[PDB]
Curated annotation (Swiss-Prot), chain A:
The keyword Transcription regulation does not apply. The modification 3-methylthioaspartic acid is found at D88. At least 19 substitutions or deletions in 11 codons can promote streptomycin resistance, dependence or pseudodependence; all but one of the streptomycin resistant mutations (K42R) are associated with hyperaccurate translation and thus reduced translational efficiency. The streptomycin sensitive allele is dominant to resistant alleles. This is Small ribosomal subunit protein uS12. Part of the 30S ribosomal subunit. Contacts proteins S8 and S17. Interacts with ArfA. May interact with IF1 in the 30S initiation complex. It comes from Escherichia coli (strain K12). GO terms for cellular component: cytoplasm; cytosol; cytosolic small ribosomal subunit; ribosome. GO terms for molecular function: misfolded RNA binding; rRNA binding; structural constituent of ribosome; tRNA binding. The modification N6-acetyllysine is found at K107. PROSITE patterns: RIBOSOMAL_S12. Pfam families: Ribosom_S12_S23. One of its GO terms (biological process) is translation. InterPro entries: NA-bd_OB-fold (IPR012340), Ribosomal_uS12 (IPR006032), Ribosomal_uS12_bac (IPR005679). HAMAP family: Ribosomal_uS12_B.
Swiss-Prot record, chain B:
One of the primary rRNA binding proteins, it binds directly to 16S rRNA central domain where it helps coordinate assembly of the platform of the 30S subunit. GO terms for biological process: cytoplasmic translation; regulation of mRNA stability; regulation of translation; ribosomal small subunit assembly. The gene is rpsH. InterPro entries: Ribosomal_uS8, Ribosomal_uS8_CS, Ribosomal_uS8_sf. Belongs to the universal ribosomal protein uS8 family. Gene3D superfamilies: 3.30.1370.30, 3.30.1490.10. GO terms for cellular component: cytoplasm; cytosol; cytosolic small ribosomal subunit. This is Small ribosomal subunit protein uS8. It holds the Pfam family Ribosomal_S8. PROSITE patterns: RIBOSOMAL_S8 (PS00053). GO terms for molecular function: rRNA binding; structural constituent of ribosome. The lineage of its organism: Bacteria, Pseudomonadati, Pseudomonadota, Gammaproteobacteria, Enterobacterales. Part of the 30S ribosomal subunit. Contacts proteins S5 and S12. The keyword Repressor applies. Keywords: Repressor, Ribonucleoprotein, Ribosomal protein, RNA-binding, rRNA-binding, Translation regulation. It comes from Escherichia coli (strain K12).
Length: 123, 129
RNA sequence: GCUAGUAGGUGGGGUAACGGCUCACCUAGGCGACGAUCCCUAGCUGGUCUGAGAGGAUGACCAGCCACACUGGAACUGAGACACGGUCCAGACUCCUACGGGAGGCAGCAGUGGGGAAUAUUGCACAAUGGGCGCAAGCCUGAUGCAGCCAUGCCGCGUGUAU
RNA sequence: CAGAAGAAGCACCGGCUAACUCCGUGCCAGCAGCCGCGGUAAUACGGAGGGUGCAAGCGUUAAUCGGAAUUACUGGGCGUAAAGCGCACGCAGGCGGUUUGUUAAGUCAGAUGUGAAAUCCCCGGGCUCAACCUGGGAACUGCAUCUGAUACUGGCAAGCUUGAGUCUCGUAGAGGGGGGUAGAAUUCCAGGUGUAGCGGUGAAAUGCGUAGAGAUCUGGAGGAAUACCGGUGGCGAAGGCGGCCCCCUGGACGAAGACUGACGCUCAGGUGCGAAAGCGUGGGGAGCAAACAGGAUUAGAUACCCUGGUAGUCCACGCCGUAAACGAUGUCGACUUGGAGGUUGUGCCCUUGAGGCGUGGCUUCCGGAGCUAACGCGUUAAGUCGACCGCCUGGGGAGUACGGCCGCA
RNA sequence: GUACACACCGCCCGUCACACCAUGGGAGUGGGUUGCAAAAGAAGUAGGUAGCUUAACCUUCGGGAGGGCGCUUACCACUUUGUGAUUCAUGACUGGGGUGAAGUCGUAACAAGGUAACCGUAGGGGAACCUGCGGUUGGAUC
RNA sequence: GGGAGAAGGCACGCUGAUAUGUAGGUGAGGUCCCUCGCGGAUGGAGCUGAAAUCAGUCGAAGAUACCAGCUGGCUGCAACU
């Protein structure tokens, strides 16, 4: 583009949309689980991944992953969610925070405990 | 149409050097002559002469050192679509001072070093290296 | 496409002051693709973060400027206000009442409930700096100086040394 | 004073990325920023041992800039990757050959005022150090005013001819608009001769024919298109333009001059032209032929093939405004090795003709340097530069929806 | 020549059936904001003034001037009415789109893809598509 | 072209002033000219006369009587008179 053309119409920056709109630029958001269930991943993976449909304090209704082996979540559980997509799960853009609010930690976890809300064992 | 005789002069020099021409010829002007004087003084060209009265013609004798053109690169800086003026403290350095910038100052057309010595800014006509 | 006090002029009025600030009359003008009008968002700056730079993003703390003070409107007093802890009217809420009628405004400091992923003590003192009044002494000052809580950040140190 | 006495955790270890083995599991449980990992010998899941990185912190999430030259002013692109408007004329706007004088607006130099303090930076000072506090400077890249410089750009005045244009003579051309006419051929009509097939296909059938077809001869009607010439030939802004004749009319080119004196280039918006199909009104209709019908083929055959056939193709006027409207290449100007051709001018010379030597315009193929991801382009550039405009910013959704404008649709 | 590379036993298109998701239309209907035309008129300020009432000044001692209250007019907040605009939500039904999954129907494209492909347009068809007219080569063979 | 008088709304009597009656209309005498008449020009007396604005004023009510559109939304059918 010539300088005259840029004087007439300047260069325009492309606006980037967030991949986590339901957080509304907050580090976490609290929600109430409306459904807790399992779902199968996209090919080439196969599993029964644990997810929950949750309604947030801002009215957004989203799907959140429940990481770790085993969980204590059911309908009406109050949980905290954070950003983070699950690649093989269609439309799962958030992760449940283990060890916050009604979500317990993972039993018998010894490594990466802080990522799953597990206290230090008394050994 | 023709709208930048100075860029035309520079391009004639560039293309003649690329084509290994002994000399290049063009219609003359006082500004072209001043630029030719700077080029000759800095040793980028061998000589120049103006011939004719009503339609003056400027001829520049190009030089080659070891089978290679002396003018390695010549580039218009200020142009009709975008004029470039620099103050004395912001005069450009060409090839870390190994080349020259032709500058039009109120004391005439000279190199960037000469303009710095005179303490003048001006219009940056071209870079030569 | 927008504009009839609209643009300008004359005269009267008005203000501390110039001015369509206001009124009467006259002219038919004025703004706009160098984006008027309308719609959405937004306190502005010194600065801050990032970047080699040019830029991009941003405006918490500190300082300058502006605006607001439950919501809407108004003036009074005064050098100065259309006035956070003044006045009057209206409105929504809360409260008192003998049912006629009355009272109130933490976006001051601390604190409570609520919302939220999340942000502290209903502390000490005017000793210092500054402010109000006073001849002064002095009184007042949640400004301020300090103290309490929090790994929130930056910086320093330790959790031993040698064998 | 006492006694090591009261004081270490968090993430990671397949690649990016520093750090590897065993066991458990067996596309399960699970991991994941991406590439991906998990299927019975998993350095990728989970535990352990060992190791790596940070450390009173360590990880995760959110958010900004960076990397991203991935909006490119510095600092990108558009033949085929996304991208040149279908083609033009042209207002505003941007840009402007050459000489002299003048002006000093841009530009440049100096000075003055201001650019709060704090913050950033430099040299120092004080807290045991550091963070922190602090003295002075630098900086605040800006604005205004004054005084100077005049090369370049702008303004003003006067010129100049090389850009651009006018005149004179001639040349080629399917350039355009209007009218007339000619010959070939198809179809239809009438008549003569004549008799059993014709037509069609891969083979058939539908169809036509003893009510006399097909074939052959003669006469007539009518519409549409112009064989040969004809050519990587010509003309035109593009779309496009093809028998012959007349009338009206546009552009290009060449040779000598004469004339004007920068009158120029580009162009958002605007306006005009714009194949075929399609639309409206009125005509026309031979041949062809969407739709449609029948016959075939086939598993089917809403096709390809066959027999028919209506809009339409044609004319007048109006609308539509799109095409792989393509060189998938915007316009204008300058510059940079060569070869072989086509076409159309013109100068000179000779022994005078398929003659020789030049010099212009347009055009086809090859190829050098250079350029390009490559393919290729290559003086008609996609090379080297300048002026102006149009356009692109991952694939799909989508040139779609909604709104506006235009249109009879 | 190629759109094939576990390499034509390749690749691959669309309707239809199933699942999920966002979105256009939709009898309309509910909110938010706002334009225009009016109605309204608390308090305040300003102008006027029947009526009532007055500490300072002047009186010829009766009053006068001036002031205040009340009343009235102008401006205007709340509020009300009518009709538009815009925006958000929602709506039986309906349009196409994306994703997944592969079930039914075919085989349009890639080789000359078995009728070269594609562009504009028009008509037709369950579907990919077919046909006419002009155009392109980004067509194989010759 | 319409829809449209869409819808909805404001003003309206009388008195005085502007102005002893205004803008406008009409137009005599007088004066000048003339190709002298049922003429032209000027001139304005007299007559007639809206509408508006400002101020005031009466009533419950000023288009006061008679007279004199109800309006809007969805839809079937027929183009229309
Ligand atoms: Cu009481
Ligand atoms: K897998
Ligand atoms: K005004
Ligand atoms: K005035
Ligand atoms: K005035
Ligand atoms: K910066
Ligand atoms: K800034
Ligand atoms: K307020
Ligand atoms: K205050
Ligand atoms: K004090
Ligand atoms: K095993
Ligand atoms: K650039
Ligand atoms: K100057
Ligand atoms: K000058
Ligand atoms: K001609
Ligand atoms: K003819
Ligand atoms: K122009
Ligand atoms: K017709
Ligand atoms: K026909
Ligand atoms: K046919
Ligand atoms: K015609
Ligand atoms: K069309
Ligand atoms: K072509
Ligand atoms: K030639
Ligand atoms: K020749
Ligand atoms: K049109
Ligand atoms: K039609
Ligand atoms: K190949
Ligand atoms: K299918
Ligand atoms: K829908
Ligand atoms: K009063
Ligand atoms: K609405
Ligand atoms: K709706
Ligand atoms: K096909
Ligand atoms: K093909
Ligand atoms: K077609
Ligand atoms: K069907
Ligand atoms: K009245
Ligand atoms: K009169
Ligand atoms: K009168
Ligand atoms: K009526
Ligand atoms: K009908
Ligand atoms: Mg003013
Ligand atoms: Mg705000
Ligand atoms: Mg950078
Ligand atoms: Mg602030
Ligand atoms: Mg409040
Ligand atoms: Mg006062
Ligand atoms: Mg105030
Ligand atoms: Mg106060
Ligand atoms: Mg208060
Ligand atoms: Mg508080
Ligand atoms: Mg809470
Ligand atoms: Mg490594
Ligand atoms: Mg194993
Ligand atoms: Mg592991
Ligand atoms: Mg960048
Ligand atoms: Mg690029
Ligand atoms: Mg392509
Ligand atoms: Mg392309
Ligand atoms: Mg083109
Ligand atoms: Mg042009
Ligand atoms: Mg010039
Ligand atoms: Mg400063
Ligand atoms: Mg200084
Ligand atoms: Mg000049
Ligand atoms: Mg006929
Ligand atoms: Mg001619
Ligand atoms: Mg244009
Ligand atoms: Mg046609
Ligand atoms: Mg039709
Ligand atoms: Mg027709
Ligand atoms: Mg026919
Ligand atoms: Mg046929
Ligand atoms: Mg197009
Ligand atoms: Mg074409
Ligand atoms: Mg194109
Ligand atoms: Mg041509
Ligand atoms: Mg080539
Ligand atoms: Mg290229
Ligand atoms: Mg469209
Ligand atoms: Mg196959
Ligand atoms: Mg909807
Ligand atoms: Mg009112
Ligand atoms: Mg009142
Ligand atoms: Mg296709
Ligand atoms: Mg096929
Ligand atoms: Mg076939
Ligand atoms: Mg085919
Ligand atoms: Mg299209
Ligand atoms: Mg068909
Ligand atoms: Mg109606
Ligand atoms: Mg009369
Ligand atoms: Mg009656
Ligand atoms: Mg019915
Ligand atoms: Mg009827």
């Amino acid at each position: 583009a010539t300088v005259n053309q840029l004087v007439r119409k300047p260069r325009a920056r492309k606006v980037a949309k967030s991949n986590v709109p339901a957080l509304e630029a907050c580090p976490q958001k609290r929600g109430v689980c409306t459904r807790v269930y399992t779902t199968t991943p996209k090919k080439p993976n196969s599993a029964l991944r644990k997810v929950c449909r949750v309604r947030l304090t801002n009215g957004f209704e989203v799907t959140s992953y429940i990481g770790g082996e085993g969980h204590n979540l059911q309908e009406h559980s109050v949980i905290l969610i954070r950003g983070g997509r699950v690649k093989d799960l269609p439309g799962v853009r958030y992760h449940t925070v283990r060890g916050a609010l009604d979500c317990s930690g993972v039993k018998d976890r010894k490594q990466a405990r802080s990522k799953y809300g597990v206290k230090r064992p008394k050994a | 149409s023709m709208q930048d005789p100075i860029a035309d002069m520079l391009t004639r020099i560039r293309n003649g050097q690329a084509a290994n021409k002994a000399a290049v010829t063009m219609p003359s002007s006082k500004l072209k002559v001043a630029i030719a004087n700077v080029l000759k003084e800095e040793g980028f060209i061998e000589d120049f002469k103006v011939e004719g009265d009503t339609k003056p013609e400027l001829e520049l004798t190009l030089k080659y050192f070891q089978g290679k053109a002396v003018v390695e690169s010549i580039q218009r800086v200020s142009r009709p679509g975008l004029r470039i003026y620099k103050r004395k403290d912001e005069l450009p350095k060409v090839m870390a001072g190994l080349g020259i910038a032709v500058v039009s100052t109120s004391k005439g057309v000279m190199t960037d070093r000469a303009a710095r010595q005179a303490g003048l800014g001006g219009e940056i006509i071209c870079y030569v290296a």
